[PDB]
Short mmCIF file of C-alpha atoms in Angstrom, two decimals:
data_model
loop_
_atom_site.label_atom_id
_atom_site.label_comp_id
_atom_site.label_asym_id
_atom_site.label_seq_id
_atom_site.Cartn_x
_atom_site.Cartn_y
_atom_site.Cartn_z
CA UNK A 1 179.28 87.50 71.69
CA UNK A 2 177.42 84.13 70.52
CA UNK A 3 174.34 83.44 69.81
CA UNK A 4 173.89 80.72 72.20
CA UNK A 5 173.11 78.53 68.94
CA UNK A 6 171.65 75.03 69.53
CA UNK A 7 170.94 72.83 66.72
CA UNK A 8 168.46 70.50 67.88
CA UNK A 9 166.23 70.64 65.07
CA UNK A 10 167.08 68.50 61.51
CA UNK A 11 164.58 68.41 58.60
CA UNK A 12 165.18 66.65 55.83
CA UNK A 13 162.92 64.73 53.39
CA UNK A 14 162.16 61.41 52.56
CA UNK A 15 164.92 60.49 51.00
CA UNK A 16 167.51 61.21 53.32
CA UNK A 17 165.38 59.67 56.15
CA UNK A 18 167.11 56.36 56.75
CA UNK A 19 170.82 58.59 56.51
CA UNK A 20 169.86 61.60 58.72
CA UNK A 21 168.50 58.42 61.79
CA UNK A 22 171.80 56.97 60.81
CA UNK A 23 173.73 60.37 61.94
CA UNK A 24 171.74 60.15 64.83
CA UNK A 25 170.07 57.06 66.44
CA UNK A 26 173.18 54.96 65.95
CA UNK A 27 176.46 55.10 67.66
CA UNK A 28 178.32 53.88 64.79
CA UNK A 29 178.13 55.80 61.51
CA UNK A 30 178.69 53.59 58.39
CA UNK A 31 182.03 51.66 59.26
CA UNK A 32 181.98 50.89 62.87
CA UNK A 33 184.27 53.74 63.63
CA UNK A 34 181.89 55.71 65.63
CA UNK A 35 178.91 58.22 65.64
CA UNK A 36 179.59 61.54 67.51
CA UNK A 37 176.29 63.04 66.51
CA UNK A 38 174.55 60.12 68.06
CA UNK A 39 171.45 61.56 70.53
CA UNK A 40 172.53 65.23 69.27
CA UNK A 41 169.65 66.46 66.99
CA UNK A 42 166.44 64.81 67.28
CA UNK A 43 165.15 64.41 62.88
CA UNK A 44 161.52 64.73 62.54
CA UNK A 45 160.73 63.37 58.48
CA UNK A 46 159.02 65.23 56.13
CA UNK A 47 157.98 65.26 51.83
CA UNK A 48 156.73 68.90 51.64
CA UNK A 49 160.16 69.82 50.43
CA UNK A 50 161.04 68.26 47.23
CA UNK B 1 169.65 67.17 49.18
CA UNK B 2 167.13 69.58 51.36
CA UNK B 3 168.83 69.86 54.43
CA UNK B 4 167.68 72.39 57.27
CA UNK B 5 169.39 72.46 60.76
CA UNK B 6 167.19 74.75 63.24
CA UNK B 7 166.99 75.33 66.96
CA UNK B 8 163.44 74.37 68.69
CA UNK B 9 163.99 75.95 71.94
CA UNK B 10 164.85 79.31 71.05
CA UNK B 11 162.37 82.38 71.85
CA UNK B 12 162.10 82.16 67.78
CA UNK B 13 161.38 79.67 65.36
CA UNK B 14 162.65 79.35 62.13
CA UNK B 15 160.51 80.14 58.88
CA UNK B 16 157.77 81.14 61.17
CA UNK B 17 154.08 80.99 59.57
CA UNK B 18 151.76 83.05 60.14
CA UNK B 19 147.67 81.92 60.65
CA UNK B 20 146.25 85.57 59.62
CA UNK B 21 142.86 84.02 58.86
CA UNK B 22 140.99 81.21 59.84
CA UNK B 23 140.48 78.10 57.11
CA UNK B 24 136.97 80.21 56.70
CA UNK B 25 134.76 77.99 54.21
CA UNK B 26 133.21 79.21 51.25
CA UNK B 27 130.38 78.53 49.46
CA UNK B 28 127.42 78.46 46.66
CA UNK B 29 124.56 76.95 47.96
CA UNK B 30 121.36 78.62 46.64
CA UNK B 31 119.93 81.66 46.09
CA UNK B 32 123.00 83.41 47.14
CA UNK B 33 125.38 83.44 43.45
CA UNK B 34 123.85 83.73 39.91
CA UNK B 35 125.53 80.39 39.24
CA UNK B 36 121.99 79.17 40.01
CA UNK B 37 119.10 80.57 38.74
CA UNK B 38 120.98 82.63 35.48
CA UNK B 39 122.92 79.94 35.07
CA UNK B 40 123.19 76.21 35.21
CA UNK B 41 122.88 74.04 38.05
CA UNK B 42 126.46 74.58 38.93
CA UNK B 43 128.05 74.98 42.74
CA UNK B 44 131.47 75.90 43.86
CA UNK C 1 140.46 99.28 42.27
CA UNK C 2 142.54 101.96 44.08
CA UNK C 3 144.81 104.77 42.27
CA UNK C 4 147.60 104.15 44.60
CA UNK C 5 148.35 101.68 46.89
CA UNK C 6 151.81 102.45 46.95
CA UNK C 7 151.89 105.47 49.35
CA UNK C 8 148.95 103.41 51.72
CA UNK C 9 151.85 101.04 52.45
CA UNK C 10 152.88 103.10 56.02
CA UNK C 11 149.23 102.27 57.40
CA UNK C 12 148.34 99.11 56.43
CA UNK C 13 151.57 97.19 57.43
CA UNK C 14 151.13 95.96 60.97
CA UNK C 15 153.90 95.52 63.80
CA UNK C 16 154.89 91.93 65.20
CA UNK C 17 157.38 92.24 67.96
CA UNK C 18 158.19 89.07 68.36
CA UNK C 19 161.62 89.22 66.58
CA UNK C 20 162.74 91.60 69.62
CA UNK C 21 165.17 90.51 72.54
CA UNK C 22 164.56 86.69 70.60
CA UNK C 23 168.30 85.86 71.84
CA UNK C 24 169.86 85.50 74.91
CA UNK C 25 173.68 85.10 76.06
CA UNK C 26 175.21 81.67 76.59
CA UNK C 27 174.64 79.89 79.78
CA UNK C 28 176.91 81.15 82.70
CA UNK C 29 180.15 78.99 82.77
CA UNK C 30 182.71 80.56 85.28
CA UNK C 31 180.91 78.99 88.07
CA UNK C 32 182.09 75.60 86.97
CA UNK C 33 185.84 76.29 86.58
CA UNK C 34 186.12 79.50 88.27
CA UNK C 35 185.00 80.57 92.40
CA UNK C 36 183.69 83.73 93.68
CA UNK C 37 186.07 85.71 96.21
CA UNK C 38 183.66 87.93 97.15
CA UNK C 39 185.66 91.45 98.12
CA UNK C 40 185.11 95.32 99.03
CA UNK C 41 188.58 96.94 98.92
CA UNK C 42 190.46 98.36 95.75
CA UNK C 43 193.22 95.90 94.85
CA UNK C 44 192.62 92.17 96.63
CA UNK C 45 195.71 90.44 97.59
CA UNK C 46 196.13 86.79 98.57
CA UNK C 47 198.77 85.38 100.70
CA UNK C 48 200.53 81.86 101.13
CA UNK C 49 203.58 80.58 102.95
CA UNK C 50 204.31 77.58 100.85
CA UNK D 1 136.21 111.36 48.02
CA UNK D 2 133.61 109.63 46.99
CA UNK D 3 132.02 110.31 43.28
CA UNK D 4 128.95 112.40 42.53
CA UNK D 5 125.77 110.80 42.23
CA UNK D 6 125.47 110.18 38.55
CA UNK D 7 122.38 109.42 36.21
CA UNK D 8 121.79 105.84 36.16
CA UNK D 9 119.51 104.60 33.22
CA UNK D 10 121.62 101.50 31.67
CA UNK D 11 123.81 100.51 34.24
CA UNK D 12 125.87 100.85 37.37
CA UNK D 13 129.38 102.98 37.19
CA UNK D 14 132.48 101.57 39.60
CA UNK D 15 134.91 104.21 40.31
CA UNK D 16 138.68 104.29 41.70
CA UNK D 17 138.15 106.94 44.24
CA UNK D 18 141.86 108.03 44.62
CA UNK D 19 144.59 108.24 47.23
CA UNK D 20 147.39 109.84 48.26
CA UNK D 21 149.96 110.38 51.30
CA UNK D 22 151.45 112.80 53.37
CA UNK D 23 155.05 112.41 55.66
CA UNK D 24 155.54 115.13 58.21
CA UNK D 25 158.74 115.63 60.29
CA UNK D 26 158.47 116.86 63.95
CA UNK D 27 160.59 119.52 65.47
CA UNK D 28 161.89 121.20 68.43
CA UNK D 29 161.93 124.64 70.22
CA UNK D 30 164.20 126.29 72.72
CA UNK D 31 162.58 127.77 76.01
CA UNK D 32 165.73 128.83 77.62
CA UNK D 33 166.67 131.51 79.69
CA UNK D 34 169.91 131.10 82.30
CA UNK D 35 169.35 133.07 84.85
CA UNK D 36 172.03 133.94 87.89
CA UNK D 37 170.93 131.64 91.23
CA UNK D 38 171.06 134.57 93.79
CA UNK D 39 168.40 136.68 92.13
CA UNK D 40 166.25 133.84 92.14
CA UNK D 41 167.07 132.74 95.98
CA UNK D 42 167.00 136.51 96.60
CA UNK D 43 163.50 137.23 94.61
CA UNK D 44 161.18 139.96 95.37
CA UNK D 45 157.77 140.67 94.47
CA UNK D 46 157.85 142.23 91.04
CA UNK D 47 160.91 140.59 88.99
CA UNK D 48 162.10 137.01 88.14
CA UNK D 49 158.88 135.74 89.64
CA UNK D 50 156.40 136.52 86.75
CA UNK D 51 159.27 134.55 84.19
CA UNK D 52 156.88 131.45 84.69
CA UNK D 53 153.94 133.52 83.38
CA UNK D 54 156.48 135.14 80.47
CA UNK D 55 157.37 131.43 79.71
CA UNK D 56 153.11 130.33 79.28
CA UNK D 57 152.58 133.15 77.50
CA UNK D 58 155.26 132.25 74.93
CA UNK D 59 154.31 128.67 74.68
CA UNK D 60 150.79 129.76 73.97
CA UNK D 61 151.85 132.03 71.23
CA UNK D 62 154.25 129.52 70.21
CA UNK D 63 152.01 127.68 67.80
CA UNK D 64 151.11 131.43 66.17
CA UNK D 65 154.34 131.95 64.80
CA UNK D 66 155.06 128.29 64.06
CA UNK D 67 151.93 128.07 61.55
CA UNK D 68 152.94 131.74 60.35
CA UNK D 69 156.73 131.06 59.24
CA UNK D 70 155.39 127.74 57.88
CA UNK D 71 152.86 129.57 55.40
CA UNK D 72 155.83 132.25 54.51
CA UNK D 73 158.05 128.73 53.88
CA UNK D 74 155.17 127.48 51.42
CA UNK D 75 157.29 128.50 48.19
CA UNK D 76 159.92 126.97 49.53
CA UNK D 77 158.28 124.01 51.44
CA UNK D 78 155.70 121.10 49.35
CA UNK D 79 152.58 119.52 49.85
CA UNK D 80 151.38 116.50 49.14
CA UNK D 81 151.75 115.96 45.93
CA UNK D 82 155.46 116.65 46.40
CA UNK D 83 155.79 120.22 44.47
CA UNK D 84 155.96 123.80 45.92
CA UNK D 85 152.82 124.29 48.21
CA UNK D 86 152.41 127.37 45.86
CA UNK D 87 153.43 126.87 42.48
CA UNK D 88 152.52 127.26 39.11
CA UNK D 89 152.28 123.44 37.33
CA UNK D 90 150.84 121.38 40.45
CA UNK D 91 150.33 118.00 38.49
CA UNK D 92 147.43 117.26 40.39
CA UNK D 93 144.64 116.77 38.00
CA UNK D 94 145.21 116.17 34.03
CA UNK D 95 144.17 120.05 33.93
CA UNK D 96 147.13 121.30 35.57
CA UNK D 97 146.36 124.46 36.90
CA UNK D 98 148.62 126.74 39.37
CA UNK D 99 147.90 127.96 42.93
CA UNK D 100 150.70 131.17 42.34
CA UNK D 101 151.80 133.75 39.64
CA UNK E 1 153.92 89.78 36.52
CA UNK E 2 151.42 92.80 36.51
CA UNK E 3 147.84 91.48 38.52
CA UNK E 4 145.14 93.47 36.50
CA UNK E 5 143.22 92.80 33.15
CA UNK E 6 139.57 93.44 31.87
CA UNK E 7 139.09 90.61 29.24
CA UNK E 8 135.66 90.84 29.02
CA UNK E 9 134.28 92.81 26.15
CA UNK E 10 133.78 95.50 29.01
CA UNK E 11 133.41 98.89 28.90
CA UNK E 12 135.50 101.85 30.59
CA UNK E 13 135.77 105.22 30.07
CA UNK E 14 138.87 106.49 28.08
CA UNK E 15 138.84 110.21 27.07
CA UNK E 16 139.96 111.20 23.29
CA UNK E 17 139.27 114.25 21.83
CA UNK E 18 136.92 116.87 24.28
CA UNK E 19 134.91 112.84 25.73
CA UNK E 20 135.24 109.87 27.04
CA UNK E 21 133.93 107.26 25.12
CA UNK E 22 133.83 103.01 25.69
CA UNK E 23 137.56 101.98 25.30
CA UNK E 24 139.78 99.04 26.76
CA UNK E 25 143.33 100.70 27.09
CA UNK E 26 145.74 100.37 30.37
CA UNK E 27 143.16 98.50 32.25
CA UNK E 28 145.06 97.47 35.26
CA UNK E 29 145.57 97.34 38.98
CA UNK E 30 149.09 98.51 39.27
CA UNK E 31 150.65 101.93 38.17
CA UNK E 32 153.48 103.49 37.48
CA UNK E 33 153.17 106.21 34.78
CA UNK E 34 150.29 108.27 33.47
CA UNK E 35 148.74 107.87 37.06
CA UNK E 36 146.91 111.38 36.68
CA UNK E 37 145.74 110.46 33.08
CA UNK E 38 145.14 106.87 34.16
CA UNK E 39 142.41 107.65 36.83
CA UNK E 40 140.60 109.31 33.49
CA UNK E 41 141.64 106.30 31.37
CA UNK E 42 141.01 103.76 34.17
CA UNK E 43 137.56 104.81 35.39
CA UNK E 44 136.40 101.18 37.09
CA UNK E 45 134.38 99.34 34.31
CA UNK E 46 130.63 99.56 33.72
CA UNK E 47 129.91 95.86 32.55
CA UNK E 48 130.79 92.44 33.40
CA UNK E 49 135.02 92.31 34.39
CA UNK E 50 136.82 89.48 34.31
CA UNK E 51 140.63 89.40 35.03
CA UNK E 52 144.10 87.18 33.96
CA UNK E 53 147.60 86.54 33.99
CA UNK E 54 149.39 88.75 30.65
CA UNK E 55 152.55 88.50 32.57
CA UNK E 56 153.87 90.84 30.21
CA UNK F 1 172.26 94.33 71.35
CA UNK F 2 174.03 95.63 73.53
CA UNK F 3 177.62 96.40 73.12
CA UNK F 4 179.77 94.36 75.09
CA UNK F 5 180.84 95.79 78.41
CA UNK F 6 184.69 97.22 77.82
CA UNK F 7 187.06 98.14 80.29
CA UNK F 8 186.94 101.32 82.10
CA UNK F 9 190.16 103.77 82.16
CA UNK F 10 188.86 106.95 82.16
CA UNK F 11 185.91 107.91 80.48
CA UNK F 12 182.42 105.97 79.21
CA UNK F 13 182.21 105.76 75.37
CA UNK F 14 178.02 106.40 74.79
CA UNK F 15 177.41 103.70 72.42
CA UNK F 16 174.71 102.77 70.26
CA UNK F 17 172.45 100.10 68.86
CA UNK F 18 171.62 98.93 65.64
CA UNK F 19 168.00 97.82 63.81
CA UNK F 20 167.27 95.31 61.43
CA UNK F 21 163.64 95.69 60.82
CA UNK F 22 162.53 92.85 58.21
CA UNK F 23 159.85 93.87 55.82
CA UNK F 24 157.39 90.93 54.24
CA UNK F 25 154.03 91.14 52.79
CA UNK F 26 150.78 88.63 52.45
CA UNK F 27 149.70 86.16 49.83
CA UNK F 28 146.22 84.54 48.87
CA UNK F 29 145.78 80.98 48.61
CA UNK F 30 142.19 79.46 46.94
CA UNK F 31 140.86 76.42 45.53
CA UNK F 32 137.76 75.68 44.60
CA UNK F 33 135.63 72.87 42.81
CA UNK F 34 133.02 73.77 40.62
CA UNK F 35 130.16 70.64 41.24
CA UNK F 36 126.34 70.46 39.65
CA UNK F 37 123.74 70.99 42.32
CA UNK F 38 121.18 67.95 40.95
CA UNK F 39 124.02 65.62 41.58
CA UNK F 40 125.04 65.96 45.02
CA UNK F 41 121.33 64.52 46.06
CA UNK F 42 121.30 62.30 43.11
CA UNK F 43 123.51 59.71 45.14
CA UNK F 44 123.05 56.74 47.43
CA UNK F 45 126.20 55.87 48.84
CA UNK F 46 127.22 59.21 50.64
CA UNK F 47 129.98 60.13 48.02
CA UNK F 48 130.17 63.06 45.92
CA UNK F 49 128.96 65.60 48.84
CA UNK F 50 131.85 64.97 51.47
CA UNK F 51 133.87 66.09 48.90
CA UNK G 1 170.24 120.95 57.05
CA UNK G 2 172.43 119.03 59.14
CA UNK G 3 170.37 117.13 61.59
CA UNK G 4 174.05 117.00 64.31
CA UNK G 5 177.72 116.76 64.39
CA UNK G 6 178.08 115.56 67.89
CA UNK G 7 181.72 117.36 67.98
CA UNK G 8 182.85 118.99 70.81
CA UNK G 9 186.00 118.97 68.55
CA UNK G 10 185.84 115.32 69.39
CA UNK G 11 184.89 112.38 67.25
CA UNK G 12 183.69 109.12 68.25
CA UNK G 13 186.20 106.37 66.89
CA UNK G 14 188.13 107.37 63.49
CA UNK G 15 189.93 104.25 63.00
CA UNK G 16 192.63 104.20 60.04
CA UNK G 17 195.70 102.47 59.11
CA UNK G 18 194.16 99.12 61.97
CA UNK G 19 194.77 102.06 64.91
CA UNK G 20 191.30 103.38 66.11
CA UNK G 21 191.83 106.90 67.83
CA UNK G 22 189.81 109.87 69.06
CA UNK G 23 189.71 113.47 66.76
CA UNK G 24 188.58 115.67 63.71
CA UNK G 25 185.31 115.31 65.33
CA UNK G 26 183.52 113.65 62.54
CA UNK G 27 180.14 112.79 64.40
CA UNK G 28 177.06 112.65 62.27
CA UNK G 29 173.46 111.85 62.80
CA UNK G 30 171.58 110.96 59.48
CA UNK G 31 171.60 107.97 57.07
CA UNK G 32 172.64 109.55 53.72
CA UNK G 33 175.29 106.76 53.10
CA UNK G 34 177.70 104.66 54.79
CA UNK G 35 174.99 103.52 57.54
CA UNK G 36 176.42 100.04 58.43
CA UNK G 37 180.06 102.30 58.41
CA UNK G 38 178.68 105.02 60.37
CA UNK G 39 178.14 102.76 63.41
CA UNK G 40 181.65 102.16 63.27
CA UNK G 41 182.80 105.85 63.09
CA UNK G 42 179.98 106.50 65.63
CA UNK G 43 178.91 104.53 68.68
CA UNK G 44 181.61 105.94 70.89
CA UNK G 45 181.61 109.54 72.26
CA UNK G 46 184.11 109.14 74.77
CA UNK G 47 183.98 113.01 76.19
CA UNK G 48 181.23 115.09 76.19
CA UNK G 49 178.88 115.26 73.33
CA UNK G 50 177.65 119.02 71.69
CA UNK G 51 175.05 119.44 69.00
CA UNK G 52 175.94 121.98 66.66
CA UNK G 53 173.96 121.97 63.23
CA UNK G 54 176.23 123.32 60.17
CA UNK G 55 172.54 123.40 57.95
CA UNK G 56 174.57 121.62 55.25
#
C-alpha cells in the first residue's frame, strides 16, 4: 500500500535559495519551456545547514 | 547541495526535536560558588 | 560515578508513542471514477436491451 | 547500598555505590479438566460440584510448588550476576567465594 | 571517545599488595573489563577532580 | 500495519504485524562566559551586563 | 526450549522455487535468526493453529 506521501516541504540553504523559488514560484523554469513544479512545494530558506 | 524534501501535514514530522528541558539559566552571582570569595572576582 | 550504567538502560529510557498509527491510507478515489450499486443477493446481474 | 559511615579527619570520601540488573521471564500454568456435559447438567450434591473448590485450592497451592521447583532448578537456573544461583566461583566481589560444594 | 578522567593531582584508592593506597590508575566513567576490581581501583576520589577529553 | 485485505476462498490466513521500535539517546549542550564581578557595575552605558 | 511450532502438520506459507504453498509445518515463535524472513514463512496459518513445544 502507499504511504500517502506528500512533499510539501523543501529546505534548502542559502545558496540554493534563488534556484529552489525558481522550481517553484515561476511557471517557466530556466528556458521558457515550462515549470511543472510551479505552486507544488512551498521552500522555506534556511543557513543552519552548511 | 543540502537538499531535504519533507511532508508538513503528516501526523509526523521529520527530524523531530525534542524540548526535554527548559532554556533553564545558570548562574554565579555571590555567595553561592567559591569563584568568589576563594577566588578572584570572577562570574560565569 | 556509577559501576554500571549499562544494565540501568531498561528503566531509564522513556516511551514516546507518537511514532504509532503516524500514517494513514491514500485518500478514497473510487468515488470519482467508480459508483456504488448498493446490493444484498449473492451474484448481482445487470440487464440491457441495446 | 550505601557505604558505611567512615572516620572523617582530613577529608570527605565519594563512593560509586554499585548496580546491577535482573530480567525475569513470565510463565503459564494449565488448570484444565474436561469434564462430560451430562454429569454436570445432571449434578448432585456430593460430586462435580466441589471441582470449583478443588480448582481454589490448587491455585492457592500453586505458588508453593512454583517457588519449590524453582529453588530445586537453582543449579541449573542463574541469578543476577548471570552464573549458577548455587555455584562455586560467583564473580561477585574480587574475593570470589562460592555459595555450593 | 571514553567521557571520564581525574587530571587533578587527586587521590583514589587503588589496592596493591594487602592496602589501598593514593593511586591514579583506570580513573574513568565507562567500563568494560576489570568491573569487579575496578569498583576497588575506582573508589570516587577524595580531593579536588577535574575531568577531559583523552579520546584514546 | 495491517496486512492488506486478500481474497477469501476458503479459509482466513491469521496474519501478523511487524515492529520497528527506534532506539535514540540524549545529549548536553552548555556554554558559558566566565566575566569579573567589579566590572559589570563598573560601566555607564548599560553594556557588558546584558551580555 | 521451544517457545511453539504452530503445526497442526500445517505451516504458514513455505514459498520456494517463486510458488508459495501450504506444508512441513515449519511454524516458529522466537527470534533466534531470520526475523525479517520469519514473517514471511509465518504470518499465515491458514487452518487451525496447535502449540506443541519440542523443548529444543
Amino acid at each position: 500500500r502507499p504511504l500517502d506521501i506528500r512533499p510539501n516541504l523543501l529546505v534548502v540553504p542559502t545558496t540554493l535559495r534563488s534556484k529552489a523559488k525558481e522550481v517553484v514560484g515561476v511557471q517557466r523554469l530556466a528556458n521558457g519551456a515550462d515549470n511543472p513544479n510551479f505552486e507544488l512545494v512551498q521552500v522555506l530558506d534556511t543557513a543552519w545547514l552548511n | 547541495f543540502a537538499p531535504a524534501a519533507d511532508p508538513g501535514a503528516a501526523w509526523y514530522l521529520l527530524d523531530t526535536s525534542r524540548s526535554l528541558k527548559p532554556l533553564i539559566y545558570q548562574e554565579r552571582m555571590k555567595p553561592s560558588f567559591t569563584s568568589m570569595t576563594k577566588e578572584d572576582d570572577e562570574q560565569v | 560515578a556509577i559501576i554500571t550504567p549499562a544494565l540501568i538502560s531498561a528503566l531509564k529510557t522513556s516511551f514516546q508513542k507518537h511514532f504509532q498509527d503516524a500514517l494513514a491510507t491514500a485518500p478514497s478515489t473510487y468515488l470519482q471514477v467508480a459508483t456504488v450499486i448498493p446490493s444484498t443477493t449473492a451474484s448481482n446481474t445487470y440487464g440491457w436491451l441495446g | 547500598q550505601f557505604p558505611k559511615l567512615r572516620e572523617w579527619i582530613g577529608q570527605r570520601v565519594i563512593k560509586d555505590m554499585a548496580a546491577q540488573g535482573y530480567q525475569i521471564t513470565n510463565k503459564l500454568f494449565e488448570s484444565t479438566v474436561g469434564v462430560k456435559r451430562t454429569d454436570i447438567e445432571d449434578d448432585n450434591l456430593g460430586v462435580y460440584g466441589p471441582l470449583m473448590q478443588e480448582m481454589g485450592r490448587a491455585a492457592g497451592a500453586h505458588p508453593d510448588e512454583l517457588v519449590f521447583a524453582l529453588l530445586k532448578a537453582g543449579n541449573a537456573n542463574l541469578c543476577y550476576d548471570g552464573q549458577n544461583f548455587f555455584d562455586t566461583d560467583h564473580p561477585v566481589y574480587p574475593n570470589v567465594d562460592g555459595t555450593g560444594t | 571517545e571514553v567521557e571520564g578522567v581525574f587530571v587533578r593531582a587527586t587521590v583514589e584508592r587503588r589496592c596493591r599488595a594487602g592496602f589501598c593506597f593514593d593511586k591514579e590508575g583506570q580513573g574513568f566513567a565507562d567500563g568494560v573489563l576489570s568491573d569487579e576490581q575496578l569498583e576497588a581501583l575506582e573508589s570516587d576520589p577524595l580531593l579536588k577532580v577535574e575531568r577531559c577529553t583523552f579520546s584514546g
